[PDB]
Nucleic acid binder design. Structure first.
Ligand SMILES: [Mg+2]
Ligand SMILES: [Mg+2]
Lengths: 55, 171, 72, 104, 98, 55, 67
RNA sequence: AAGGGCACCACCAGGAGUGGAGCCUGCGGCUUAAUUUGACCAACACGGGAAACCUCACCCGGCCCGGACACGGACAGGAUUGACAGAUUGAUAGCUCUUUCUCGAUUCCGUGGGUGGUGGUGCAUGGCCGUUCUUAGUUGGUGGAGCGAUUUGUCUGGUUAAUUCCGAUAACGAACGAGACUCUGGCAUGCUAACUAGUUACGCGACCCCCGAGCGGUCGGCGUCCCCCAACUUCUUAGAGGGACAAGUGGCGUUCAGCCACCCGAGAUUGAGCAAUAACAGGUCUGUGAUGCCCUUAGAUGUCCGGGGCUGCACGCGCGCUACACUGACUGGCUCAGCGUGUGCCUACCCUACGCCGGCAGGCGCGGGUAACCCGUUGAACCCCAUUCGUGAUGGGGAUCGGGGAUUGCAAUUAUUCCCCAUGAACGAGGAAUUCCCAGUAAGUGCGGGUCAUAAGCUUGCGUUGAUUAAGUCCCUGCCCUUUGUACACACCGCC
């Protein structure tokens, strides 16, 4: 709560630095092509994004 | 350009914008007969045209709500003042739209109608509004712990191959 | 390609090139009397192999091979 | 000025890209400006092989999502000034353009 | 909760300069992307507008990771009596050159 | 005693709920509202600052 | 649960009365027995706290002690 | 219970294996404060789960309220907020204590009411996914049989990958599924074109030559869009088209559906994607600001910080990698790919050529690249060519362990990774059993992507070298149909 230690621990890197841009989860995150998307969320939004399972 | 981003990342970013815009508009105009949206992007400006059933309700009083929406998108995405435009257009033959019927049946079920009664009404609307076939599935539990699935189908449906993408509309 | 595929492509390329040049500038009557020997020796000296490769599936190490499954 | 420009066409649906390449060439002939044929860059294949399930249980089933980016370059040349000669976009949604100087 | 008076009045005057306001949901964001020079983290923006909504002054819509607070008419009148504004000043979304 | 050592049920079709079962039962024979149907259901600020701060 | 330590009591302020650390004599003369932290951003209204062997401004006007 | 049919997640005949050793990794058990937890064909290199912090849900301690809002108190004569010094604490948490400042209606307290939760419930649910099953099965209209539910159609049989068709036929005509469809592979010297792909021709060269080749040979040397200073798309890219259909022949077959053989042909079965009516109380509340209900909510199961933990080992199991060698290992030389990525809203993190220093891991300065422009003609491994070894647990094996050095990070111990010198453990082809598989397939062999501050024995792709065996069957194992039995219909996890 005090400012010196509330955010003292850095997260410049690692798995905690990155989160899903739809649900803030940190597991199964796709970082390719700047996606930054939780994978279940990406499977949900793939059609709107433009990804098609041609085969 | 180094200041610019790669074209592959650009198209991904565009689809991210389209997906998020569609979801936000869905959660905002859920009761207002939301149907869909499209964007035309040009170097001069980017245009957002929202397709809906009740545009006179989507519009605010003297366009107040549309002004409300056209500012909040620019504030979200850091858009130029004069290069973001917002339009509302009605949907032709909304009885053929999967989303518009889905929202309407959602409201009917919130209204507490009998599920068989509400599904038959929307199915009749679709069939008499012109469609080779239509099918609605309602799953969930009512008046008990156990869940049920209700299937209301008439006409013809297809499930396999490429034609299912541009023939059968889902919601 | 690799060493074998390059060699095979080269030898069929030679046969096809000579036979086409002969057909272009001199008679095909004498082009035939070498084309027949080429095919009756090895048809691959004039006709390319249509087989390339098969994609890998997500059920095993390769195109048709599947990973070990164990019930106990 | 003697001016020449390269318009870069990038799109995700081939039919629209071929259509824009059509009427831009057709405009080039109408303005009787010499134009090179649209050269096609190799198609970019964005592949994401994610897993179908949202959980851990299943038969290890994978979904292969694709995204084709098609790129084209059309070169316009003219011994006179060109930008004031052509101020037409003739575009549809789904395809983007960027015109650059051939010198730079 | 605990907000400096300059912070509340600056945030509020922003919500009246423009009828809407967005805010990325991050309590640890050191500076809001708007009104950066006022040097107030996004948390104060969060708590102030969620307290306006509880009172019945703003409508909250939430997409993926951003808030979409929409000022109401009761919010308009409540801001005027709080900031001592005459009955002529309006947001852009309420009125523009008409 | 209805499960194994980990806790997986030895009888999946022995319905452990006293109200509902393996099958869904339509209360009152699908009668009334808020329930499944029946056969009968089938038939400007910047200018204000400019004048405030000038004096 | 079963925390062995006891519930730590939070700091309670004394709810102090009026400041009254400066007086007047001979029918009114401004006189202060307190220091002032002379930092420009600290200001000339703020008074440094008095301590047994140091001086501390109310803001972060450093702390000067007697070495 | 009987009869038909199908299937390399069945067999045959084979291939490579696993089970035998070491090691990586995942379960069960043991221990612990914790070793967080789900899942037991369809769980066990799965939760894209390669965890030092975070992740983190577990354990030990310590901050904060980020308890909105309404009401009642306290209040500018003070509601209250932080705070240098000393103790105190791991802490530079004013967390607490002495200490006075400072802050100034924003808060504090009490009553309600929120809210949040990787907390419980997947046997309350949506969605998603898996499986039966990707097998071939499913349903109307009209008509016939019936008092009726219902039934025929949907079948003795031939055929196919397939109720796929042909055939007998109280049925005729349809619809879903299969097919068809989309993408992908091979062929078009046919069209369209390209300095971000190039190819032939030519001009300079550089070298080889000169016995004499001279319209001689090599050049990823330089130029011919340096724009007037060559043509063209064969090679590359990718659009529009074409092309194959059992089409030609012969034979078998009811001579029908089809099957087989052969000529010509690039191709005579390319792989995938999608995928019915329904069922599995199948898996997921730990993907979600998806969610009902319950629990917790200020000594917090909210949330932050620090440390430990997810690795811990008397043992059992699964997926794997490295080997057991001479078809080899080492030393050197020669030497050909294709997928595809590459500088970030948050987000501080890119691929890297050259030159120099170092033996190496690496270090330093200039570059290039948001990309058919640079890395990169991606000079990959295997393989090929020569030398050594010599049947020896040996120059196989590189497990275990000692010492030292670099990169990344706030942090490397329980060793992150990498480099060097050491030691050299079992293992000499693996029991009963058991997995996967039919053509660029198996198999060897590397390289990309995802994971990533650091990184693959995993996974997903790509390419290279490249076969043996078979064109069959129900024997085993499963699955489907028909018949049959039923006192089952919550439907055998049943009734009794
Ligand atoms: Mg098909
Ligand atoms: Mg050693």
């Amino acid at each position: 709560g005090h400012q010196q230690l509330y955010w003292s621990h850095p997260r410049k890197f690692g798995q905690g630095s990155r989160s899903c841009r739809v649900c803030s989860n940190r597991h199964g995150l796709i970082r390719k092509y700047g996606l930054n998307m939780c994978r279940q969320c990406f499977r949900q939004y793939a059609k709107d994004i433009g990804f098609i399972k041609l085969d | 350009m180094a200041v610019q981003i790669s074209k592959k990342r650009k198209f991904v970013a565009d689809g991210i914008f389209k997906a998020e815009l569609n979801e936000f508009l869905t959660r905002e105009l859920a009761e207002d007969g939301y149907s869909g949206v499209e964007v035309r992007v040009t170097p001069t400006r980017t245009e957002i045209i929202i397709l809906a059933t009740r545009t006179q309700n989507v519009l605010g009083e003297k366009g107040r709500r549309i002004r409300e929406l056209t500012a909040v998108v620019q504030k979200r995405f850091g858009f130029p003042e004069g290069s973001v435009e917002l339009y509302a257009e009605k949907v032709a033959t909304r009885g053929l739209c999967a989303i518009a019927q889905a929202e309407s049946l959602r409201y009917k079920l919130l209204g507490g109608l009998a599920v068989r009664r509400a599904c038959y009404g929307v199915l009749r609307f679709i069939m008499e509004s012109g469609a080779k076939g239509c099918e609605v599935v309602v799953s969930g539990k009512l008046r008990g712990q156990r869940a049920k699935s209700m299937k209301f189908v008439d006409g013809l449906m297809i499930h396999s191959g490429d034609p299912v993408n541009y023939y059968v509309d889902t919601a | 390609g690799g060493h074998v595929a390059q060699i095979y492509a080269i030898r069929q390329s030679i046969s096809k090139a000579l036979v086409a040049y002969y057909q272009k500038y001199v008679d095909e009557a004498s082009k035939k009397e070498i084309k027949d020997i080429l095919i009756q020796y090895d048809r691959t000296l004039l006709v390319a192999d249509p087989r390339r490769c098969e994609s890998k599936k997500f059920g095993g190490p390769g195109a048709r091979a599947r990973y070990q499954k164990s019930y106990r | 000025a003697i001016h020449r420009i390269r318009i870069t066409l990038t799109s995700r649906n081939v039919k629209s890209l071929e259509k824009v390449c059509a009427d831009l060439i057709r405009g080039a002939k109408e303005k009787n400006l010499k134009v090179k044929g649209p050269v096609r860059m190799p198609t970019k294949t964005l592949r994401i092989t994610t897993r179908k399930t949202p959980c851990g249980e299943g038969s290890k089933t994978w979904d292969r999502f694709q995204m084709r980016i098609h790129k084209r370059l059309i070169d316009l040349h003219s011994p006179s000034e060109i930008v004031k000669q052509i101020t037409s976009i003739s575009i549809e949604p789904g395809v983007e353009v960027e015109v650059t100087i051939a010198d730079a | 909760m605990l907000m400096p008076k300059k912070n509340r009045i600056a945030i509020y005057e922003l919500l009246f300069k423009e009828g809407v306001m967005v805010a990325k949901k991050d309590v640890h964001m050191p500076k809001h992307p708007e009104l950066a020079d006022k040097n107030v983290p996004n948390l104060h923006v969060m708590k102030a507008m969620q307290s306006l909504k509880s009172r019945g002054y703003v409508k909250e819509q939430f997409a993926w990771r951003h808030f979409y607070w929409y000022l109401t008419n009761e919010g308009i009148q409540y801001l005027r009596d709080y900031l001592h504004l005459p009955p002529e000043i309006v947001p852009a979304t309420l009125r523009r050159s008409r | 005693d209805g499960f194994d050592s980990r806790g997986k049920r030895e009888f999946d079709r022995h319905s452990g709920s006293d109200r509902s079962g393996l099958k869904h039962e339509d209360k009152r024979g699908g009668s009334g509202s808020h329930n499944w149907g029946t056969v009968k259901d089938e038939l400007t600020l910047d200018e204000w600052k400019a004048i405030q701060n000038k004096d | 649960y079963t925390t062995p330590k006891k519930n730590k009591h939070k700091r309670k302020k004394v709810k102090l009365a009026v400041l009254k650390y400066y007086k007047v004599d001979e029918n009114g003369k401004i006189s202060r027995l307190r220091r002032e932290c002379p930092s420009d951003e600290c200001g000339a209204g703020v008074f440094m706290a008095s301590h047994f062997d140091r001086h501390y401004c109310g803001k972060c006007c450093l702390t000067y002690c007697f070495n």
